[PDB]
Design a protein around this ligand. Structure first.
Ligand SMILES: OC[C@H]1O[C@@H](O[C@@H]2[C@@H](CO)O[C@](O)(CO)[C@H]2O)[C@H](O)[C@@H](O)[C@H]1O
Length: 134
């Protein structure tokens, strides 16, 4: 929406998407959206430093045909304003697996059953420096 948008990713099950960026010193929130297109997201990954009444909370959701799913939140927040952070994402039929800094890993249910992740879009206070596949 403001940041990098990539399409035709063809990321297949078990393949790793690695994204490294700079978290702004006064960051309020950033977003990585993954799926088919802007209306169909198997993962909306939204670390909220200070946004929507939330503080240092990772908010996740899906979007299916334009409709937001049921939000999920993690207890941990291994992001620091003003530092570099790497996020590594893979999926299978059941879950997306998101690996974060400081060894933290979590799963978010795969609610869309897409054949591949073809679309990624970044937004907010996170300046993408490197994106890789494998
Ligand atoms: O669910 C992902 C989306 O959440 C929205 O914010 C939600 C508000 C509506 O503003 O209702 C809540 O569930 C109450 O806390 C918020 O999480 C964001 O506006 C979207 O950008 C997106 O993150």
């Amino acid at each position: 929406a403001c940041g990098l948008v990539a399409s035709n990713l063809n990321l297949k099950p078990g393949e790793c998407l690695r994204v490294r960026g700079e978290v702004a010193p006064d960051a309020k929130s950033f977003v990585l959206n993954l799926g088919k297109d802007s209306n169909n997201l198997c993962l909306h990954f939204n670390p909220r430093f200070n946004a929507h009444g939330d503080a240092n909370t990772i908010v996740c959701n899906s979007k299916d045909g334009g409709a937001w799913g049921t939000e999920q939140r993690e207890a941990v927040f291994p992001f620091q304003p003003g530092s570099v952070a790497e996020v590594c994402i893979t999926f299978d039929q059941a879950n997306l697996t998101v690996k974060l800094p400081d060894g933290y890993e979590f799963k978010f249910p795969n609610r869309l059953n897409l054949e591949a992740i073809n679309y990624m879009a970044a937004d907010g206070d996170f300046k993408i420096k490197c994106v890789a596949f494998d």
